[PDB]
């Protein structure tokens, strides 16, 4: 009320002065708003356009599918094959005709590492003098790098190296006794020291014949010249197809370097499965058998260890004439490494003792060829970027998880899979081995275009599901092929997709309702001709998996691709605003839209909103916005999202030169704005919009994320613009949330609608029903949408008070100004005129310093300016509203076309529920199939789905893409969640690729918590607990490789100490039980750890009430080892080390900039007059953002990080860390048994943990009862349906926040049974014990009160959690209104579709 009255007074404060908007933002003008709010739609135009659109859709359907009259189905499909063939060879002879191309005999090999497999050598990482002397017989003969490794060998015979011998006894002394020694000048560290003892920092004598820079320069000039599609890849397909039994064998070739921690896994299962006294692991047998599969597991170990050693060697700094020499732990393989160029480039040569190498190559010719020198094989130098070194670091875990996934996908059990892959008679084994080797080739060759080809396979495969009224046109995807092919794998993938297009064009996938359930035959793997039978592997063949990282990209081709897109359509501006909201287009150009039909869509959507929510709906849509604008606080905008400092400066590079650009956080501007009494975003929107008018544009900076396939191309807008965006967003989102069919506003409608469609169809009409497709692609959604339509759309909905806010926000969205990365312009100033991407780079080069006038690039300016389109992430909900408007019109037009076409009594039917996200459209039309008129209804549905995208979309600048699919009965797709007939699939491989995230949290309990969160993420989307268990074994080898289990001999001493004390803060990876690995989180393992293992006795000794908080640690020294550490639990599971590489200087500078209050008591004493659920005022908002800042995890240096540096510290420091001081005296005179009140304090929801673990406590090896029919039943169940005695929230803040239960008498008594604190007394500090949990009562609120609920989809119906954990384990309004009138002039078109469909 009072806040509501103040917000409405602020709204009355806002005003629109038109002369300023017409001045600075030209296509915004008072006349256009007045005509649109005033002029009703002229119906003659709207009839003219829907009639012409109907004709177009008919003619396009005819000449697409029915190429003439009197055509047999075989003739139609043969002409389709002719068309697709000609389109294909047009695509190929795009590539054949090129300026340059490699000769077909010349080869490339994709995996640059050698195929070697080495029998186990003498232990230790030192390059010993015997490993120098024994390999002397090199026989150089002036071959490539034989003379260099001979020089290194001859030096190795002498002692002319920094470490010819490394001793572990010195490092044990350094761990147990802190003052180990002085620091060697050769030992170059990055974080927390480096020991001349822990890593071989030996430097070998320089080669006089060759310097690697010119060798890579000539090889790079060759890499510039492209690859033809007629290049032979017969060796590639030979490798992936034929080699099956070679890959699997157990001869202990190199399994040891990562097979070290087996006993630790035997400990971890002993916590969870008490009754395995046989040492009888169940998933660990497959884990170590797969790792023991020598032909791939040993080779993946070699990849992982060279990746880890190189990541350690990036931080190593070497004087330029010399190069470092290293050796892997307990291996014959030597790495000769040069970080000569610090520009993310490391140069590596490998050398294996010929005595060490044996029993194979892994395979020939799909690997870098190796030179023989008799004594030792060797290889030529190869270059690597640091972004690729993280991928090489994680090769065993990624390949284990990908092979286990593909074994599960083709029905092989994920624990017996290496045995089945050894003896591969069934085609499921051959296809699993094919796809696993394909994933291996993708991983070792990191390239965006290779994943792009894998992604295009999705649209090619989906085109085969189109219904007989339609015909497949998979050759439509030939437009979206890569411009240039840059490796043999792209050639193989392109040839695969070309033959795939040929097969799909030949005939479609043929559906059959045999058992009252549709199923598709003729399906096949997109990358090999092996037939499939399951939808899930077909979907999972596409969606190539990607790693996520938040980092900039400095490769100029990547930023040129970023900047290309908006600038492609910037030139397509029609320079005439007659169409842009002033007048109706007849044949709409690019960026145009029709005023009258936008108003008709608005009026129709008002009519459906009226008929759903009643007569006063606008009043309802009024108040919802007020609630949203009472919810929109500055704290909501106070997040970790970055913010641009490009305002009013950095415009000319000469003034902008010599100063880096830095993206300030949102918190500095939010706290500067909240330093005044500016309690809400709207109260500051008033000032911000005037500021934005003063500058006369929007300031935006461009930020291309480094990863690929994730959220790339981020547009970091400014603070005032963020404020304006947020108020416009809350308006847009309010009116959009009144829409049922929208999905971005209400995702439960998205999960509900595809499930509910079957019930609505069967309830309305009796019998089977067909469907149509989802045109989820939208052609250039962001670039092409002018914003005047957004303004007119939103102004049609809101009350008259809001229109100035809408008009001014859309007005700043018209004209917009975005900055490039300054290193890009530093490149372009001194660039050559040989820029290949002349569409942008030559154009920008002339625009910046040149003759060419360009309407986006300005003279000597550091910005791209665009008077059209929109950003990607700016105005999501407004565009979702536009798309919802369009689709709501199309629904009634669909009923109109169905009534005009088939019968007047078809409104009883045609259930046509929609699904429209930001740019993802979807539609499905159910109609009965009783009579033989259903084929006519299918023709009508084809015309309807045609007109939805291809025809009335253009009038709303809504452009359908070729990537759309049309008329795919019993098939639908939306947001990569495919819905086949009574079966729901999603591509799970995208999360299996991510579960080996290798997280840099640097807390050692948060690390395992993050691993558990990712594994639960795989369990949420598809997957199985056996697959999750194998992925967790991959995670555990990854984590124990963050410790030096293949990187330091001290890990061998970490083992025994680790067995003495099993706690996750010590670094002991707690394995979840395999029968339910995904439901139980890290809390489940911690509860079982304290309940079973003696680690609770350490918690019995070290505890806050008996011992103390983070200041008081059981180790009297704070920093235990020279490598960093702490004992701070922070109201959570206790970490026994920190290892915080973050300097924390940047967080200190952040805290200085936020000007937050310093004392921090004011939350604690004034906690009862802050509702932490909701702040109210600038002081309270300031302390809430300060609480958000000082939380763990969200610390700037906790967020800030890097992968190579983190992995280098992970064994340089971590092997020494935690060892022989914390572990030497962890608990003496320790209380054997833990208190029970303290036990429930550690885990408040111990009751749920006991209920969930009661079933999977004791369990056998495996209990498979094979089912006959396997298929999802469209069923979902939640384990969190089980609730605590208090159904109400656990917060009860001031006993006023929630009113879900009345008068709370017993509801109050149950909580203090568990809490053991006075919930009464206003929840004050002294509620029986001041600081009973911790000092911060906000921290007490966080830790004491917390609830949650999980969710999972099932194979068979649920009744309770036990059959959940059993089954989820792998078993293997009125249509008559808005009466628009259409033209039925060409009924001969309908006649020919009907007759030829009858004759087929």
Curated annotation (Swiss-Prot):
GO molecular function terms listed in the Swiss-Prot or TrEMBL record: hydrolase activity; metal ion binding; nucleoside binding; RNA-directed RNA polymerase activity
Cofactor(s), names only, from the UniProt record: Mn(2+); Mg(2+)
Keyword DNA-binding on entry: no
Catalyses which reaction(s): RNA(n) + a ribonucleoside 5'-triphosphate = RNA(n+1) + diphosphate
Enzyme Commission number: 2.7.7.48, 3.1.-.-
Compartment(s) of residence: Host Golgi apparatus; Host endoplasmic reticulum; Host endoplasmic reticulum-Golgi intermediate compartment; Virion
Keywords: Host endoplasmic reticulum, Host Golgi apparatus, Hydrolase, Magnesium, Manganese, Metal-binding, Transferase, Virion
Chain ranges of the RdRp catalytic domain: 761-952
A GO BP annotation: DNA-templated transcription
Source taxon at top rank: Viruses
Annotated Gene Ontology cellular component terms: host cell endoplasmic reticulum; host cell endoplasmic reticulum-Golgi intermediate compartment; host cell Golgi apparatus; virion component
Function description: RNA-dependent RNA polymerase, which is responsible for the replication and transcription of the viral RNA genome using antigenomic RNA as an intermediate. During transcription, synthesizes subgenomic RNAs and assures their capping by a cap-snatching mechanism, which involves the endonuclease activity cleaving the host capped pre-mRNAs. These short capped RNAs are then used as primers for viral transcription. The 3'-end of subgenomic mRNAs molecules are not polyadenylated. During replication, the polymerase binds the 5' and 3' vRNA extremities at distinct sites.
Record's subunit section: Homomultimer. Interacts with glycoprotein N; this interaction allows efficient polymerase packaging into virus particles. Interacts with nucleoprotein N.
Protein name: RNA-directed RNA polymerase L
UniProt organism field: Rift valley fever virus
